[PDB]
Amino acid sequence: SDIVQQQNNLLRAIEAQQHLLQLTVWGIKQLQARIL
């Protein structure tokens, strides 16, 4: 039970980190469009 709970925790962390990654990709693309 507690191992499965910990997997839920880490998956949630990965999901949140993916949102951050998508944000950084968006930001770089905007800057690239402008400084080119």
């Binding site: 039970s1 499965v4 997997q7 839920n8 998956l11 990965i14 999901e15 993916q18 990654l21 998508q22 990709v25 690239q32 080119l36």
Partner: protein
């Protein structure tokens, strides 16, 4: 930058597939506890 765009797309696609797969496995594992 053209190669960069391609690689961003490929890895974005892969991560999405892995997260979906993980979500499905998580639900299966939680059911199996019972």
């Amino acid at each position: 930058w053209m190669e960069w765009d391609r690689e961003i797309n490929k890895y974005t696609s892969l991560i999405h597939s892995l997260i979906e797969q993980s979500q499905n496995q998580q639900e299966k594992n939680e059911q199996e506890l019972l």
